Design a binder for this molecule. Structure first.
Ligand SMILES: NC(=O)N1CCN(c2ccc(F)cc2)CC1
Ligand SMILES: [Zn+2]
Ligand SMILES: [Zn+2]
Length: 581
């Protein structure tokens, strides 16, 4: 308790000695409260004018226009202690899973040098503004690293002074850059060295773009078994137990020397004990603490979510196969059955899954899995939008399984080769491309962000008639040589290479499911969904608004060219049959 967080709490108290007040009207039941102090501040979504001007028909579609307008009752909840049989299943599974993941990988420290190179090309390493402006400045100043050194030796002593979270179905906890470095130092290897790659973890999909995920689901479908299950968890990060955090910390068992002690400190001092500052309007800062739930950086969060999801889904598979009879208690013979199951079929059962953080698809041995719910509920991983003891509804067709906010279509090229393509309701895609985050965007920066969306559409969503047309229009309206941008970043569309050359590299040359490597010579060789399937997934094809937009598209392109001004532009519209004269 307060010995681990006291020092952190004692330090904040004294930067605000002209404020500290133990509020009696504090709203916390599950978060431990420590005090308050004086503050006052708040980033709302802005519209991308280049994308909106080139998507006029969607100006009257509420599902698009409402996306640009405008659960903290879930963070203040309390997951119960699992039973002893559940705790034993999780510890045995976690111990086996870290060994499998570590067979072909070496844990290692990430460096000041790697951290610097990343901050100098923008990943979302959630830091704060304030002694230096950006992270980009702090990383050059020896002051910062001296501060990092102080905290580091403190962590080696089993103590913490400055690793404090900041709060803001989405709750995002920023720390100062120093604490983010120490996390990266100790645990960055999980992401940097691809521990959750499909090759290394069998269930995972780390480094897999949307052009891979559909092929992976189709390979899972080829397994003998029952339906494909894709149950979402209700608020996964809020259901991570202290038991889960202790099983995750067992990765330290594979480490050595300094690295081991540094990683143990991150787990002990910042994950299994947390200190958070929160803005309450009644505007005072609430310094609160808890032991459980997920509060790491987003990249470490992704890897530990993947690990604990893989563990939970193997245990649900064990329950469906009758490996254990009750979660109340494991017999000695049932522990040896679990261990022997993992050794005998563990890797085969991982290969039955596709797991991206809290997202999963499982193709179990048979449909007993659907009603195998005691371990899943007792681990606290309660299914979203279904009654707690109602059996899961599975999918009979891999093309209708939801995963990573998509479904996947099988599309046959005029030459017989098979594309497995990502898809989602088209209003969602248009709605997202019409939004920018943050302020002070120039017209050139706004245009380069529109071009990033247009190029993503050409590569991933070429099979949607409206998106291939709108992508060609945006790429015609934005100067040919301007570089696509994004203030939050496999993204093969982030390039000034010709999009047909990138299409060939991604879908043909580098595609391990495609045996015939014959390059495609024009966009007209690249197929669409059936016209009715395109409408089912939200196409406006057949509407009067869409026909007028398509026919008059050069007028829209010329409106945006006139706003940007006298620049070099390329006409991409004749890459499509209907404009090719
Ligand atoms: N291999 C992976 O684990 N990622 C996960 C995130 N993912 C994604 C999710 C939603 C979305 F709208 C677009 C892309 C890409 C694949
Ligand atoms: Zn610390
Ligand atoms: Zn679709």
């Amino acid at each position: 308790n307060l010995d681990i967080i006291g020092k952190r709490i004692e330090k904040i108290k004294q930067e605000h000695e002209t404020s500290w007040h133990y509020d009696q009207d504090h709203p916390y039941k599950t978060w431990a409260y420590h005090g308050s102090y004086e503050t006052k501040q708040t980033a709302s979504s802005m519209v991308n004018g280049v994308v909106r001007l080139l998507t006029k028909p969607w100006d009257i579609i509420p599902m698009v226009t409402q996306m640009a307008m405008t659960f903290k009752e879930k963070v203040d909840t309390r997951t119960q202690e699992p039973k002893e049989g559940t705790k034993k299943l999780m510890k045995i599974t976690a111990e086996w899973l870290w060994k499998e993941l570590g067979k072909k990988k070496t844990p290692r420290m990430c460096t000041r040098e790697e951290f610097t190179r990343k901050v100098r090309s923008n990943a979302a390493l959630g830091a704060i503004f304030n002694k230096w402006k950006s992270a980009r400045e702090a990383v050059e100043d020896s002051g910062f690293w001296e501060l990092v050194d102080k905290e580091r030796n403190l962590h080696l002593e089993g103590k913490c002074e400055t690793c404090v979270y900041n709060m803001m179905s989405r709750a995002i906890w920023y720390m100062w850059l120093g604490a983010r470095f120490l996390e990266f130092e100790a645990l960055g290897f999980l992401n940097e060295d691809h521990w959750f790659s499909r090759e290394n973890s069998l269930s995972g999909v780390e480094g897999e773009g949307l052009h891979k995920l559909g092929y992976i689901l189709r390979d899972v479908s080829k397994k003998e078994g029952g339906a494909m299950y894709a149950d979402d968890t209700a608020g996964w990060d809020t259901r991570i137990t202290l038991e889960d955090l202790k099983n995750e910390e067992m990765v330290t068992n594979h480490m050595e020397g300094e690295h081991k002690k540094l990683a143990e400190a991150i787990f002990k001092l910042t994950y299994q004990n947390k200190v958070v500052r929160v803005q309450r309007p009644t505007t005072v800062m609430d310094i609160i603490s808890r032991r459980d739930q997920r509060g790491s950086g987003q990249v470490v969060t992704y890897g530990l979510n993947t690990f604990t999801n893989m563990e939970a889904q193997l245990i649900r598979q064990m329950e469906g196969e009758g490996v254990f009879k009750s979660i109340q208690h494991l017999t000695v013979t049932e522990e040896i059955a679990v261990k022997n199951w993992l050794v005998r079929v563990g890797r085969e059962r991982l290969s039955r899954m596709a797991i991206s953080g809290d997202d999963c698809v499982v193709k179990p041995l048979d449909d007993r899995f659907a009603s195998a719910l005691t371990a899943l509920n007792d681990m606290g991983k309660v299914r979203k939008d279904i009654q707690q003891w109602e059996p899961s509804r599975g999918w009979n067709d891999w093309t209708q399984v939801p995963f990573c906010s998509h479904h996947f279509h099988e599309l046959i090229m005029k030459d017989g080769r098979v594309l497995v393509v990502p898809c989602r309701n088209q209003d969602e895609l248009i709605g997202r491309a019409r939004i920018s985050q943050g302020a002070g965007w120039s017209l050139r920066e706004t245009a380069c962000l529109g071009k990033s969306y247009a190029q993503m559409w050409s590569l991933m969503y070429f099979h949607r008639r409206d998106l291939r047309l709108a992508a060609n229009a945006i790429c015609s309206a934005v100067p040919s040589h301007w570089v696509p941008t994004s203030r939050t970043t496999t993204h093969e569309w982030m390039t000034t290479e010709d999009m047909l050359t990138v299409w060939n590299r991604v879908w043909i040359q580098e595609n391990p499911w495609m045996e015939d490597k014959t390059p495609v010579e024009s966009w007209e060789e690249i197929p669409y969904l059936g016209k009715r399937e395109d409408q089912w997934c939200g196409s406006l094809i057949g509407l009067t608004s869409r026909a007028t937009w398509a026919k008059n598209i050069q007028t829209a392109i010329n409106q945006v060219r006139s706003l940007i001004g006298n620049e070099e532009y390329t006409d991409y519209m004749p890459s499509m049959k209907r404009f090719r004269r």
